[PDB]
Design a protein around this nucleic acid. Sequence first.
RNA 1: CGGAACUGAGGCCAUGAUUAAGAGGGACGGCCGGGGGCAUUCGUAUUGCGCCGCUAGAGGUGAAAUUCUUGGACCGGCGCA
Length: 136
Amino acid sequence: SLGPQVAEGENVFGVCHIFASFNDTFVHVTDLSGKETICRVTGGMKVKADRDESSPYAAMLAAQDVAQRCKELGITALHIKLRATGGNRTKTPGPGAQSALRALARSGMKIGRIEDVTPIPSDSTRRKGGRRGRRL
RNA sequence: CGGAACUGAGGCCAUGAUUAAGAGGGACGGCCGGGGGCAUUCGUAUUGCGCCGCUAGAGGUGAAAUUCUUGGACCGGCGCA
């Protein structure tokens, strides 16, 4: 975890893959390639209370603690690939998503170019429910 | 000289055929259209597999457990199905 680059003239980039689901939050640091990882760490290690791991309070706290540890490793710049569950399923990030986001706003990492990358299908397989739907 | 069938060539008849339906059928001209059938091409995602990377949780709920998981899960990359 040592970028030999000089600090400001140019950045040694990593790339954080921020998964924000409605029941989990991943954080997966990698190289420019992506194939090689530096540090991945999740919330579920840091907080053990099933009901409020995806809670926005939990996802924020998680994002701060995780981003803190990656900064700790000393990577100055990051590419970003925020991602949600996707597919035939939901296209909206869950309640953790946004608390994590604001948390990473205060956390301090130098940010390269951002992009969205949730895998939307052209034409999809059937959603997990009835025809009559998740009813309640 | 009268009355039935058959058979030749005339003269004349203003010589003979109602219109073409804001009824209809059929033809023609270039169009029009997720109209039909057959064959052909493409896309991602998907779930599955194989391989590589870090790793201890992952799942899922209003809240939890059976469930998968240090015999390497989930996450990421490349190929295949």
